[PDB]
Amino acid sequence: MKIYVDGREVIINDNERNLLEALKNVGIEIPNLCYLSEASIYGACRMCLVEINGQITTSCTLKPYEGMKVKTNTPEIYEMRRNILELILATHNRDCTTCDRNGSCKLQKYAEDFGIRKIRFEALKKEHVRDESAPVVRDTSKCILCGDCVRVCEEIQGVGVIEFAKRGFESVVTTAFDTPLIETECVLCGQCVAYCPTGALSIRNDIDKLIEALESDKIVIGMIAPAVRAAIQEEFGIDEDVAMAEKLVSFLKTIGFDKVFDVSFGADLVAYEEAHEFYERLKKGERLPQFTSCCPAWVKHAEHTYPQYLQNLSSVKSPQQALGTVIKKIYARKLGVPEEKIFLVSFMPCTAKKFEAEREEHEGIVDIVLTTRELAQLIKMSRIDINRVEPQPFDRPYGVSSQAGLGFGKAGGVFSCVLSVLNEEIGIEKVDVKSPEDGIRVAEVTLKDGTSFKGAVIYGLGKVKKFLEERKDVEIIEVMACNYGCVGGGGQPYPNDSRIREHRAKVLRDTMGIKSLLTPVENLFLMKLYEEDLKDEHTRHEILHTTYRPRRRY
Amino acid sequence: HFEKVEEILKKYGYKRENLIKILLEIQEIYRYLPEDVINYVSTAMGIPPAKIYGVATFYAQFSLKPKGKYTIMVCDGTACHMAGSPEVLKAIEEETGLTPGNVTEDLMFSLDQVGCLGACALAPVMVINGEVYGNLTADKVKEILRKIKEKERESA
Amino acid sequence: MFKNAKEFVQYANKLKTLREKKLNGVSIYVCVGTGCTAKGALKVYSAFEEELKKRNLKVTLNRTGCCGRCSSGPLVKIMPYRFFYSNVAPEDVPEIVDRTVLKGEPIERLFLTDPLTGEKVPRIEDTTLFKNQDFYIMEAIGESECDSIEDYIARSGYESLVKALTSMTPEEIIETVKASGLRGRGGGGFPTGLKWEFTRKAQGDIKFVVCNGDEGDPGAFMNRTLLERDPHLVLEGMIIAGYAVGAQKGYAYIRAEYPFAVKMFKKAIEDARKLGLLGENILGTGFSFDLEVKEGAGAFVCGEETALLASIEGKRGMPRPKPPFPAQSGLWGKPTLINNVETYANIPRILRDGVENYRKRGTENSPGTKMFSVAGPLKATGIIEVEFGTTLRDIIYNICGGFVEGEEFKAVQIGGPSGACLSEDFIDMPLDYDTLKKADAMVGSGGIVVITKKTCMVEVARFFLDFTKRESCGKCVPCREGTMQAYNILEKFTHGKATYEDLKTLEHLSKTIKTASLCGLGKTAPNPILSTLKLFREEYIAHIEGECPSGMCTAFKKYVINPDICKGCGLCARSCPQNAITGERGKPYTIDQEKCVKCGLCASKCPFKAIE
Numbered sequence A: 001m002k003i004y005v006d007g008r009e010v011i012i013n014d015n016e017r018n019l020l021e022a023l024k025n026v027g028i029e030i031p032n033l034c035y036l037s038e039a040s041i042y043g044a045c046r047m048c049l050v051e052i053n054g055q056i057t058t059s060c061t062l063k064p065y066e067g068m069k070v071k072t073n074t075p076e077i078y079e080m081r082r083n084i085l086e087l088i089l090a091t092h093n094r095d096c097t098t099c100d101r102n103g104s105c106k107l108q109k110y111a112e113d114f115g116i117r118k119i120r121f122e123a124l125k126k127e128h129v130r131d132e133s134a135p136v137v138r139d140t141s142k143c144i145l146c147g148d149c150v151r152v153c154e155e156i157q158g159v160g161v162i163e164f165a166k167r168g169f170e171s172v173v174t175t176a177f178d179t180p181l182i183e184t185e186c187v188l189c190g191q192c193v194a195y196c197p198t199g200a201l202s203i204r205n206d207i208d209k210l211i212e213a214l215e216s217d218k219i220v221i222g223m224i225a226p227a228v229r230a231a232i233q234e235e236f237g238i239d240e241d242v243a244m245a246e247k248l249v250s251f252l253k254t255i256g257f258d259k260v261f262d263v264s265f266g267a268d269l270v271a272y273e274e275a276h277e278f279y280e281r282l283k284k285g286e287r288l289p290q291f292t293s294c295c296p297a298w299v300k301h302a303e304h305t306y307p308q309y310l311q312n313l314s315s316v317k318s319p320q321q322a323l324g325t326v327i328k329k330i331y332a333r334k335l336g337v338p339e340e341k342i343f344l345v346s347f348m349p350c351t352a353k354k355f356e357a358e359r360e361e362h363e364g365i366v367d368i369v370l371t372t373r374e375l376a377q378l379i380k381m382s383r384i385d386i387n388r389v390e391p392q393p394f395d396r397p398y399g400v401s402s403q404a405g406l407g408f409g410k411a412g413g414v415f416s417c418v419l420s421v422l423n424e425e426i427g428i429e430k431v432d433v434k435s436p437e438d439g440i441r442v443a444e445v446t447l448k449d450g451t452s453f454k455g456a457v458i459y460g461l462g463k464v465k466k467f468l469e470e471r472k473d474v475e476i477i478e479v480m481a482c483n484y485g486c487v488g489g490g491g492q493p494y495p496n497d498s499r500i501r502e503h504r505a506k507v508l509r510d511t512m513g514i515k516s517l518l519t520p521v522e523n524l525f526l527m528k529l530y531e532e533d534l535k536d537e538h539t540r541h542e543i544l545h546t547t548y549r550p551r552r553r554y
Numbered sequence B: 001h002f003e004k005v006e007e008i009l010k011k012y013g014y015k016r017e018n019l020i021k022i023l024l025e026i027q028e029i030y031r032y033l034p035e036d037v038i039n040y041v042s043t044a045m046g047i048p049p050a051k052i053y054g055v056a057t058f059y060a061q062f063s064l065k066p067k068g069k070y071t072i073m074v075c076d077g078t079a080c081h082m083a084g085s086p087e088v089l090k091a092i093e094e095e096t097g098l099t100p101g102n103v104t105e106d107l108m109f110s111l112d113q114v115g116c117l118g119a120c121a122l123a124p125v126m127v128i129n130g131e132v133y134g135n136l137t138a139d140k141v142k143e144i145l146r147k148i149k150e151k152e153r154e155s156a
Numbered sequence C: 001m002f003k004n005a006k007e008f009v010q011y012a013n014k015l016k017t018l019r020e021k022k023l024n025g026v027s028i029y030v031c032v033g034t035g036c037t038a039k040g041a042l043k044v045y046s047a048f049e050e051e052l053k054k055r056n057l058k059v060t061l062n063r064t065g066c067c068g069r070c071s072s073g074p075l076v077k078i079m080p081y082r083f084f085y086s087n088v089a090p091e092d093v094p095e096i097v098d099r100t101v102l103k104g105e106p107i108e109r110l111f112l113t114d115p116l117t118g119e120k121v122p123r124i125e126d127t128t129l130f131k132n133q134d135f136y137i138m139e140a141i142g143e144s145e146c147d148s149i150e151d152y153i154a155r156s157g158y159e160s161l162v163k164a165l166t167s168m169t170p171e172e173i174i175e176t177v178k179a180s181g182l183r184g185r186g187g188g189g190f191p192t193g194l195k196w197e198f199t200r201k202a203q204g205d206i207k208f209v210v211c212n213g214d215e216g217d218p219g220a221f222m223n224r225t226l227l228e229r230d231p232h233l234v235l236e237g238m239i240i241a242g243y244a245v246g247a248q249k250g251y252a253y254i255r256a257e258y259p260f261a262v263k264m265f266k267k268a269i270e271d272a273r274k275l276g277l278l279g280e281n282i283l284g285t286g287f288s289f290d291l292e293v294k295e296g297a298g299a300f301v302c303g304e305e306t307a308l309l310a311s312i313e314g315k316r317g318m319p320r321p322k323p324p325f326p327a328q329s330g331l332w333g334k335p336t337l338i339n340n341v342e343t344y345a346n347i348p349r350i351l352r353d354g355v356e357n358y359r360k361r362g363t364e365n366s367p368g369t370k371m372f373s374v375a376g377p378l379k380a381t382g383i384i385e386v387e388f389g390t391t392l393r394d395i396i397y398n399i400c401g402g403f404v405e406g407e408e409f410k411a412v413q414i415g416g417p418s419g420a421c422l423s424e425d426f427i428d429m430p431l432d433y434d435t436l437k438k439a440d441a442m443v444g445s446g447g448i449v450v451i452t453k454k455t456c457m458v459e460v461a462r463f464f465l466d467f468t469k470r471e472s473c474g475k476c477v478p479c480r481e482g483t484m485q486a487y488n489i490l491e492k493f494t495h496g497k498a499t500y501e502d503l504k505t506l507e508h509l510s511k512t513i514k515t516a517s518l519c520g521l522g523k524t525a526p527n528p529i530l531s532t533l534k535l536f537r538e539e540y541i542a543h544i545e546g547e548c549p550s551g552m553c554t555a556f557k558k559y560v561i562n563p564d565i566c567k568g569c570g571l572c573a574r575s576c577p578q579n580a581i582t583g584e585r586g587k588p589y590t591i592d593q594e595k596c597v598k599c600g601l602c603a604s605k606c607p608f609k610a611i612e
């Protein structure tokens, strides 16, 4: 398949959907604003204009053919491309300094490259929507109406709370009747933010509160999620490492953190309690199938969609809330300090954890939740070369975890850790792992004393509806709202695509491989905590368990 | 609470591809599309409210605000526009103080621009609750609006 | 009529005899179409009905469709003695009854005045306007029942459908349509036969036939009139096409804001289903077909094929890049046939006649007639039908009677926002699909609107761009933002704030919108700007200079106090922000606009001495 591009021979692949993709594969780039994420579609920007047979048409919607002659850069195409970019920029809210995409915005880069230095059109007034009621922040004045967020929220997440509304110049992506996002069925997964190519969808920034807390005379305690340490290196343009968590601990100590703990300890704690709860349920055959509750986005989705299953949800709170409650109700007592003098910071890869920390059932435990991007911003603001910081371990007694507990950061980690706990408590004869579809895995598990069961690992909200409709034999279901689990969380470094998430999972697996402890019971600090401050089911329920209530609009 | 909405939906059988007709009939029942009705239709038909809201805001027939006791439709077709439809619009603005697509706080009047009404011989044209008023100038439309106001003042 | 052509033949012949009896007998025919209802046709029909029942008089009262004289008030036609009363009123109904139903003496004053000679012609059939027109689709004028399949059957209706079902195989139907030279009346002008070829050849045992009732113009109503006056002709064309392309289901897309057209089409579908012409079997041929009236929630963009299909499915009327064309994957990804109402109406006529007979009307490359709605200040307006060789001058003067006292021709719009503006040069040109394409114009969906000297071309362009930017679906950048920017520039032009930089920006933005827009709406969005600039540039230059050649741009309209109309009260001194009173005290005063900003504060305290 030979084609003449600007009058020179170019060989493209035989089977090609459109000319633009073929040219892209053979290394020829055509300026466009349609290919913006993995959830992108062609047809909207109209900037991919090419001239074939004396006529100008989009290359993204053009089937190539043998001997075809295409001109990619002509005075007419230059004029029209510049006109289209000027049209976009005329009504765009151009405040890059305070924008979250500043530095990684295709629109900003094109403005720089095309040499747009004055707005030849007029910034006609629009009825822009600005929403800040949720950890996911909306600003439609920066929106380019690419529609990626709509497709993500509907097809990938299966919620569909944001849609195109109105038409023409007043077209806008928004909730129904411009409802605040916190009052809708949004699960605050942040996938729309992970896919948005502009600052239209962003994450609530809470660095000011952290700085104010570190300035005051209270004890600031921090805790880092498993998946933060596997992705934070992306902002610094460096290779992965397994010492990232300890370098983060050293940096946090430098900027004035009294203690830094590992949320993997909370993951081990949660897996222990979850495994015991699930075993008791299997013994009595009550409230099955059991649903994991460590994903706050899935918990909110269940409260919105499956009010009948809220009893099937595990009563154990997520690792963040469990560890924070232990720190506030046991460690603070141990440290000889009032509970109100501790400022507990949580470093998470997730936007839904920000919502969880504010739930009326968890009010006050976690003071602020900062995402991987907010931690990377802190490091970059300090200008400290993180590639040269000497690593130091986490503070005692919540600075170590089993490899399974650290595995919570990728899909299937919590079910794996639960299986490890059960194997060390009873023993697993065999496990038969299947892959019914892309993001679903079902395991058939046999214990030593009979009583086999089936567990399922579902990552990617929206795969849940069909799975729960079409199956009734699983006993425990593990739901993670984000694809690949928490390594692809909404608060993770941008861009957040499938190959990035696979690499993050590989980095997390490498970091797991170097951990000496194998199972939560081998964690001597966890067992000490149990034997000392979590003896009876009363304190265990008060510290490690939460309740769920339905959500509906009226 | 919404018995007639259920009647409509069951007549159309909650079919997604009947959403436009469902919305039109619900509107003619309610004079507009209330948020509560849309939420209930969403839960009943298995569609998120955002999708229905987008469809409803895309089409001109639908309205998210209540129509007044007297609806004023001014034709903005080519013939009616060249006949002086903007003068009619200005007169209605100066008398009732409302822009097309809006309603008074009292819900007494509501204006809408519409396409050709097939009655180009009467350009500029205006329809008030089904009564066609043709060959309209500023004075005539002010006269009609006023007289409606007096008629409403006499039966209150 | 149910499952055999012979029974249908006896039924049709009986209905024909009843129609002949009714033609002989005294019958009242009231034009209840749009244009006549807005003038009081329903009330006149009620007046006839009440007077007939009150006097207890077998005279038949029937509702008929448009007769092409919508500007001439409600229309009434007395059958045994065709008189075509016009500008009828409900206060003269008893006079009509007593003096014509029984006595039969014509009422001269209620007759149709011909503008050429101003003489009351007894009938429209022997009127210059009727002679100038060429009726092929517009049939049984004034003597056709709209809400009855019985009259349609008595008028030799559905015979083409029956013969096609029983005689001609679908391939022969498609070949006849190809040879007939029928070209899409929706504006595209594409040959209907080739589209039918594509739809039939598409692989699949499930296909659909979709009828587009939209006018493709916010100023046209001819498709609505054709739907309202003879829905059964459209339905017959739809069924014939369904059999031709192997489709099993049909969809008529009529706007929900056309209550009469929707109700008439629903009634026609129901009747056809009661008579066996629609159902799980027709004439025992084994061909199944049903029709549904899909009500359009209202969107100019839904006149696009892909957007139309999206709206049929209950989604936003958003178009998409054409490949795959709807002929291969339309409704729910199935091969769909989409044609205009006029295109379907032309089908049963083509079947009834032959290829050659159809080709006799029109030109070589555009056989047949075309329906047009003519508006603007004009002696005779309404729906007209003419061959594809009639010039615009012929329509404007010989068929529409010319302009009314106080107006004269400046321009004409032939397709609405997507059409073109024709100056005095292009009206001596036959209306042909081929000829207009290289003259930078098009036939259009059928709309025509004359422009008089009291009109400003800049305002015409502003109006069309206002409509276009309100109707854009918002999907693609060129249309969504370029139309808004072009509208803003045109608004500046109409307010005397435009410079030559704005002229250049408008030209280049128009080219960008024309070439880069995804679908037809945006591609034709700058058509008014481009045509007006090509033929009326001097108007734009004058607006830049600071003066409107016409007087309709309200921006300037200087306010002057008439000295012969001024009482000379002397209250205008210090009463103005500009204080440019300069009015003699004790006598009439004069106002100077040298410092005035033209705010509109001169009619505050004066005896109507200020003119805006």
Ligand SMILES: Cc1cc2nc3c(=O)[nH]c(=O)nc-3n(C[C@H](O)[C@H](O)[C@H](O)COP(=O)(O)O)c2cc1C
Pocket: C183, C184, C185, C186, C187, C188, C189, C190, C192, C195, C212, C213, C214, C215, C216, C217, C300, C301, C302, C303, C304, C305, C338, C339, C340, C341, C343, C445, C519, C520, C521
């Ligand atoms: C904005 C827009 C509006 C249109 N409106 C109509 C319409 O109202 N009626 C119509 O027949 N075609 C309309 N069309 C053209 C259709 O896309 C299509 O060509 C037509 O329905 C096919 O009918 P035909 O084969 O009889 O010409 C419109 C196109 C565009 C871009």
Ligand code: SF4
Pocket: A092, A093, A094, A095, A096, A097, A099, A100, A101, A102, A103, A105, A106, A107, A108, A142, A197, A198, A199, A200
């Ligand atoms: S999205 Fe943000 S960074 Fe990109 S152009 Fe707009 S303001 Fe600038």
Ligand code: SF4
Pocket: A136, A152, A153, A157, A159, A160, A161, A162, A185, A186, A187, A188, A189, A190, A191, A192, A193
């Ligand atoms: S945060 Fe998740 S649920 Fe909320 S709008 Fe974005 S993708 Fe949808």
Ligand code: SF4
Pocket: A142, A143, A144, A145, A146, A147, A148, A149, A150, A173, A192, A195, A196, A197, A198, A200, A201
């Ligand atoms: S909010 Fe972002 S992802 Fe959604 S349409 Fe706008 S630019 Fe695209």
Ligand code: SF4
Pocket: A188, A189, A294, A295, A296, A297, A298, A349, A350, A351, A352, A353, A480, A481, A482, A485, A486, A487, A488, A489, A490
């Ligand atoms: S999968 Fe992980 S990152 Fe995603 S919403 Fe759930 S807890 Fe947050």
Ligand code: SF4
Pocket: C301, C319, C471, C472, C473, C474, C475, C476, C477, C479, C480, C517, C518, C519, C520, C521, C522, C523
């Ligand atoms: S040209 Fe206009 S109507 Fe057509 S797809 Fe683009 S925005 Fe929508």
Ligand code: SF4
Pocket: C561, C566, C567, C568, C569, C570, C571, C572, C573, C583, C589, C605, C606, C607, C609
């Ligand atoms: S206020 Fe009016 S009427 Fe009186 S002197 Fe001035 S211009 Fe004349």
Ligand code: SF4
Pocket: C559, C575, C576, C577, C578, C579, C580, C596, C597, C598, C599, C600, C601, C602
């Ligand atoms: S129109 Fe206004 S600014 Fe001009 S003279 Fe009258 S009051 Fe003064």
Ligand code: FES
Pocket: A020, A032, A033, A034, A035, A042, A043, A044, A045, A046, A047, A048, A058, A059, A060, A061
């Ligand atoms: S890549 Fe955007 S329209 Fe072609």
Ligand code: FES
Pocket: B075, B076, B077, B078, B079, B080, B081, B115, B116, B117, B118, B119, B120, B121, B123, B125, C218, C219
């Ligand atoms: S343009 Fe107004 S009625 Fe036709």
Ligand code: FES
Pocket: C031, C032, C033, C034, C035, C036, C065, C066, C067, C068, C069, C070, C071, C073, C074, C075, C382, C383
């Ligand atoms: S509708 Fe009455 S003459 Fe046309």
Ligand SMILES: [Zn+2]
Pocket: C456, C457, C458, C459, C494, C543, C548, C549, C550, C552, C553
């Ligand atoms: Zn002007």
